[model samples]
Target: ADGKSTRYWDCCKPSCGWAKKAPVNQPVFSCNANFQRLTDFDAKSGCEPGGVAYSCADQTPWAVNDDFAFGFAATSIAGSNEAGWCCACYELTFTSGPVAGKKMVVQSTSTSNHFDLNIPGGGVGIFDGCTPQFGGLPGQRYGGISSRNECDRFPDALKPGCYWRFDWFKNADNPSFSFRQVQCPAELVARTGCRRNDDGNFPAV
Candidate 1:
């Protein structure tokens, strides 16, 4: 098979050997502003034009502080074991922008592993996890990263616009995953970073 940015493979039982089937929808980029696929490998597969690309090899100059926003969402499943094992969480540092390096946590409410950020003037940007392993699948853990700038998704909330980037990774042993940020726009300082007051109001940060 080709070196696809997002590839999907089937599982095999102890008796039946591994078999290659049609490629499942492992996660692809969509033009819809509210929907975004968060995979570094597939992001380069033409999800969004001019979108930022990153990998485990990328070097981040900024600290994992409070100025930046970060998060992830699941897009596809690997095996039957992973059917309902998808989830997402996030943390941010508000250092430079309107909010400046402040800390915030965003989370998802349902099995869907997606999250939305409430930027002041810019429209909302969506981040969906590409590979979500369920139960305890082997070699099914991989990290995806993403970022957005000057988003104006929320109107009622007033905040400065800026850039935001995210870094995600799977647990060393468990099937769960985590995401963090490295960079953010200079406008978050005034925007109050991410809301930490109440978790029920906002839609997963």
Candidate 2:
């Protein structure tokens, strides 16, 4: 499947954090406002006033090497919704951007109408968790920071992934990719603790 890829860092709890969204070994990990992972699967979102759970900082994408990267995404596939994709993985071959022809493997952790790469400094969506976690951050609510130096405002834990936008990702704006369903990688599975029961049915590539 082919689709446009955008980016977001709303810091809100992933939609797939709700266990009922998929038949997986576990739900996608979510954290408290303090960045501590929560054991309960139903914690309320920190993005909500007085709510506590938010997306974990480690969910940010990282480069494995020059040609490949691993990350999680708020995904929207043409024929399916979260029920079919939650915790599922896809291999994205960049069709546009300076990173064109490079590949990225993303696991679906939330639902959206397109591939929404989850990177820090990559826009805080309708709900804002960055403020409470990082405080007085710079950038737009949806467009995020434009310059690489602006990444300094982000925390050390998120800086590498922020720098990744300029380094490996070439600061691509809404890169497009040809994607295909694939089995989840163990590295990603270890992070999200989500592995669809039917993952064995997916292709390795």
Q: Against the true structure, whose lDDT is highest?
A: 2
Per model, state how many residue pairs clash: 39, 0
Q: For candidate 1, lDDT tens digit of each residue in 110-205?
A: 112222232111121132111111112122233211222222331111212112332121111112223342222322211111212222332433
Candidate 1: worst 10 consecutive residues by lDDT?
Answer: 10-19
State in Å the error of residue 198, model 1: 26
In model 2, which runs have C-alpha deviations exceeding 4 angstroms?
none
The most accurate candidate by TM-score is 2
Q: What C-alpha lDDT values do all the predictions have?
A: 0.22, 0.86
lDDT of 2 at 4: 92
Clashing pairs in 2: none
lDDT (Cα, tens digit) per residue for candidate 2, span 15-127: 99987998888899998867779999898877777777888878878899999999989988887877799999999999997999999999999982489999888898677
